């Protein structure tokens, strides 16, 4: 599924992502727009073999189980495939235990790179919320 912007910023506030960890939606919306463009089916291969899923890209290092990533964890407890749902829930679930890892929303290098520091509200303004 293709979100619009202000449907995903209203799907990220009603799965309680805004503010979450201090972190404003439009923080939210900003790393989703550069990880994925709104799209739950993105996916993209790393170099050293695992593989980001969904609207905000999370890696199967780490977070989720692929079956084809040696030596990875699940820390999410979830198929990388449901990382790619028209349903965000797993992506939003997964998302709150990668931003409390320590590293707060740097974990998203585009979101160190594209939105950190910038005028992130711009991403919900004018969204019904
Ligand atoms: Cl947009
Ligand atoms: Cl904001
Ligand atoms: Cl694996
Ligand atoms: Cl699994
Ligand atoms: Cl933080
Ligand atoms: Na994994």
Known sequence: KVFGRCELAAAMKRHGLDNYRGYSL????CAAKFESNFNTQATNRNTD???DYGILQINSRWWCNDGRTPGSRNLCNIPCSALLSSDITASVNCAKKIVSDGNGMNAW?????????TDVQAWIRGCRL
């Open 26 to 29: 439009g923080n939210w919306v």
């Open 49 to 51: 073999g695992s593989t």
């Open 109 to 117: 290098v585009a979101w160190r790179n594209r939105c950190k520091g």
